[PDB]
From a paper:
The housekeeping enzyme glucose 6-phosphate dehydrogenase (G6PD) (EC 1.1.1.49) is the first and rate-limiting enzyme of the PPP. It catalyzes the oxidation of glucose 6-phosphate (G6P) originating from glycolysis to 6-phospho-D-glucono-1,5-lactone (6PL), whereby the cofactor NADP+ is reduced to NADPH. The LdG6PD monomer contains three domains: an N-domain (Q5-K49), the NADP+ binding “Rossmann-like” domain (residues D50-I248), and a β + α domain (residues D249-K552).
We observed conformational changes compared to the apo structure due to G6P binding alone. Within the G6P binding pocket, this conformational change was mainly visible through Y251 and surrounding residues (H250-Y254). Moreover, the angle between the “Rossmann-like” domain and the β + α domain is reduced when G6P is bound. Structural comparison of the monomers shows that regions I248–I260 (α9) and P481–F499 (α14) rearrange, with the main chain atoms shifting by about 1.5 Å and the Y251 side chain by about 3 Å. Furthermore, residues H250, K254, M256 (α9), H312 (α12), and Y484 (α14) adopt different side-chain conformations. Remarkably in all structures, G6P is bound only in subunit B of the G6PD dimer, although subunits A and B are essentially similar (RMSD ~ 0.7 Å). Finally, we interpret the G6P-induced shift, leading to a 45° rotation of the N-domain and a decreased angle between the β-α domain and the “Rossmann-like” domain, as a conformational change towards the catalytic form.
Residue numbers in the entry:
A (entry chain A): 10 to 471, 482 to 552
B (entry chain B): 8 to 31, 37 to 51, 63 to 472, 480 to 552
Write the structure that this text describes.
């Protein structure tokens, strides 16, 4: 009896959240349709069948997935659970070999997999009863990241499994995951180049790189130069959290598969472009790690710029991965480096109710830090398509809501309807929930009147990490940052980053839970952005 | 009044019960138990208002005109002292009974509106006269002037709205009779005349009739009604097209590849083939309604939101059309359905033997102006087809690069009946696996969110806007598009293709549509 009340109460709060994000102006009809979407979301789940949707090419050669730092935090929370989810869906070959590689000694190996790895398997994956069947593919290798001799032994271990493959293709494909700090990558790749390359008889090698790719142009070019003598770009897969989201991948399709959007994607129709990233959480007591990164290096240099490239890129000659990336780097060469006056920075303080402590109230943050936890800036693309178009990138910690979306405003509708209408908007939201809607003006369906009584109406339309790993198995480099793409990305931000490190610009304080500095919203308004709400 | 208050309710209840019972009693018992559980601007009140419905004894007035007037009062859109006068040819010595047994019978939703029905009929009076007697219109004017002077308001006089629910052969006499006997008082008041039935059958026939009414009423007083010009989605065409930059920038020949305006009905002529045989499907709906839609689609941006500014642009684009010719038209005539439920058109006894009247017609129009040059506009209408469907389908040119056969052409659909809908068909990638991104699917982008069209038309007439009313110049330019073709049809140069009822029509129709820039992918 006591258990009944919790479920009905837990459901309505989810129902309340949905009717507040979609904002349907016919209140009654939406809740009925939205409610039926989540009824099948929790129920109707069984553990009877595992349909492997793998291509005939994937089962031809043995596959080996090596996760370096398997005892680490990133491997246990995200890397291994995603491999489990991929396996649950039947996306791994039946004879996949997974090897955990770490420095740490582990006795009672099976206890560790069940007590450490299985512990972080998610409740949403808990409807999997074949977890024991999945762990059968996992083995543990204790070695150092600097020993070519250990890699020769690892190679003997992988070769044992590779030669035991019951398929036509010989050799074996090897996907290496570096769930490690960036200071180790050059050492592991040198060691992998000398000790654990794929067999000469057949098999490719691919390396996934996770942690930040430097902190400036020089740091990244030094790091990219360390790996060039070992791996080309068809082998290096620089991963990104957002590129795997379906709505971000769909931007290429919504823009270029449709003439309606194609014809207005220029300066002659587009008036203001905004790419916003909002989080409710602060630094959560680990502000010391963030003090050396800043909000710009964290999410604006890599993720938001990755988004901005997909919006402004020219038409690729084809849908091939590197053809798409070429246009991605080419538009990133049409940008001007961000300047000091085109940037407004912020740093969050304690909340009004005191629930969220300030950034400087953290003991791990150095005293007198000018590290930004908020930044809004305008970029300029100098080409025939985007000349004069404002591109606003915004990122902020401990703000009024967690919200990640694109909001494009089209050119002001030149007076056939006057003030009765406003600017058209195209919205692409990826977080908290996927949604893509267009805001246009229609007449109010009550009476004809003067036809000046109109209303703004929206035209709605409804895991990332694991899909990206699969693209790596599938060899889809479309959603991975390229070397030239990374260096030209860095050249946009480094002059400003150097000015930030020398103290030329300092963040404006703002209480947690607000939108941020008052000057930021003014700066956005001063750069072609207007709203009527 | 301890007896009249009981009797008035008892009379109001039973008169509602009679209207509803159409089938072969026990229903009156069920309805009583259902009814047992059932528990304006200052300018509008400045002058008296008088609504005259000519031809009240006709089918159109009793079924459609007066029931719609009831809805205007239910919505609270009529002034509290409005005076409605029913004018008809036949004398009926059933003064109060006729209002309850004939007019109320066709009122809708009598299970909630039967308590304001008695207050509505109190505004209705009946005048029996001839449509040709200046003396009678003098007597009618003397009845109206008494109520006008009995108005408790600052402004004197009164406004008079005349409705001609009559065949067109009676219009010239009634407008002449109004001009000599029942014009508004010299102290104040406007006059407006609503005209419904077809305005001739060609350019000349329409021209003779338009010349007949000019010596009696100008264009600010003549409100030529059109059923669809008041439709919510058709009225919305002007807003969605110009209030939004997204649509404005693609509304030309550079982005648009084919436009289709389709009107589909499942019923045949329903044993009334004799009346339709002399009209044809082109004059019935294609010359007036579909072209009224077509005018709103191809009009340029009006200089303002003023009514005549919009109608000027409505006329200006209809003058850029070339008259439809014989090779750009496929006609059809329906035969008995495959299920036998719908008898053939020639199976009607009221239809002449060997008749070539079209029950189906698709034709292409060419608009020669900068915005639409080369854009095919297909107008299609058909009786006794696979479904009742009335919509606009604009197909844009798909840029193949860089998606090729993985994408198709974007579509804009605006449906007004049977159900309101405005959606865009685009291709997005399938939200499954990333794969090659060539795995896409065509997804439609639907629009999310008193009512009836006829009622709104009357109000716009009461408000005096005239945006949604056919203009004199607009009518002449509309006919000159269709008249050369109708003459070739009336001379037998083109003959309809037989097709069984329930199908899409003749197979040659779909070929003609396919041969003019329109593609399907299913
Ligand atoms: O005018 P019709 O074709 O007889 O049908 C009723 C129509 O009347 C209109 O005025 C209504 O808005 C529509 O709901 C409907 O399409």
């Amino acid at each position: 009896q006591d258990a009944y009340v919790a479920d009905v109460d837990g459901i309505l709060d989810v129902l309340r959240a949905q009717v507040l994000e979609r904002k349907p102006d016919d209140i009654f009809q939406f809740i009925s349709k939205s409610a039926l979407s989540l009824q099948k979301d929790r129920g109707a789940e069984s553990c009877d069948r595992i349909n492997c949707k793998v291509k005939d090419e994937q089962k031809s050669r043995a596959l080996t997935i090596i996760v370096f730092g398997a005892s680490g935090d990133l491997a246990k929370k995200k890397t291994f659970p995603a491999l489990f989810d991929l396996y649950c869906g039947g996306l791994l070959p039946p004879e996949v070999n997974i090897i955990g590689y770490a420095r740490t000694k582990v006795d009672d190996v099976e206890k560790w997999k069940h007590e450490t790895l299985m512990k972080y398997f998610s409740n949403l994956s808990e409807r999997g009863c074949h977890a024991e069947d999945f762990l059968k593919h996992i083995s543990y290798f204790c070695g150092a990241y600097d020993s070519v001799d250990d890699f020769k032994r690892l190679d003997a271990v992988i070769r044992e499994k590779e030669n035991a493959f019951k398929g036509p293709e010989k050799g074996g494909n090897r996907l290496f995951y570096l769930a490690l700090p960036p200071s180790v990558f050059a050492s592991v790749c040198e060691s992998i180049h000398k000790g654990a390359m794929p067999q000469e008889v057949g098999g490719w090698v691919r390396v996934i790189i996770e942690k930040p790719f430097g902190r400036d142009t020089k740091s990244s070019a030094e790091l990219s130069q360390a790996l060039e003598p070992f791996f080309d770009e068809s082998q290096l897969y620089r991963i990104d959290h957002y590129l795997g989201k379906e709505m971000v991948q769909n931007i290429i399709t919504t823009r270029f598969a449709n003439r309606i959007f194609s014809a207005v994607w220029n300066a002659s129709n587009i008036a203001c472009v905004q790419i916003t990233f909002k989080e409710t959480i602060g630094t959560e007591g680990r502000g010391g790690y963030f003090d050396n990164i800043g909000i710009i290096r964290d999410v604006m240099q890599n993720h938001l710029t990755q988004i901005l490239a997909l919006l402004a890129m020219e038409k690729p000659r084809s849908l091939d991965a590197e053809c798409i990336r070429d246009e991605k780097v080419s538009v990133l060469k049409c940008i001007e480096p961000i300047t000091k006056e085109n940037c407004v920075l912020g740093q969050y303080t304690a909340s009004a109710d005191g629930s969220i402590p300030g950034y400087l109230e953290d003991v791990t943050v150095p005293e007198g830090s000018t590290c930004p936890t908020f930044a809004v800036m305008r970029l300029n693309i100098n080409n025939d398509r985007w000349a004069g178009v404002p591109f606003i990138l915004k990122a902020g910690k401990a703000v009024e809501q967690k919200y990640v979306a694109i909001r494009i405003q089209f050119r002001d509708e030149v007076h056939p309807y006057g003030e009765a209408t406003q600017r058209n908007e195209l919205v692409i939201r990826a977080q908290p929930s996927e949604a893509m809607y267009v805001k246009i003006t229609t007449k109010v369906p009550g009476l004809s009147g003067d036809l000046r009584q109109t209303h703004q109406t929206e035209l709605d339309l409804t895991d990332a990490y694991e899909s990206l790993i699969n693209d790596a198995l599938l060899g889809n480099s479309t959603n991975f940052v390229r070397k030239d793409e990374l260096d030209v990305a860095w050249r946009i931000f480094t002059p400003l980053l150097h000015q930030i490190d020398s103290g030329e610009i300092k963040p404006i304080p703002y209480q947690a839970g607000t939108r941020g500095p008052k000057e930021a919203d003014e700066f956005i308004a001063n750069n072609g952005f207007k709203h009527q709400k």
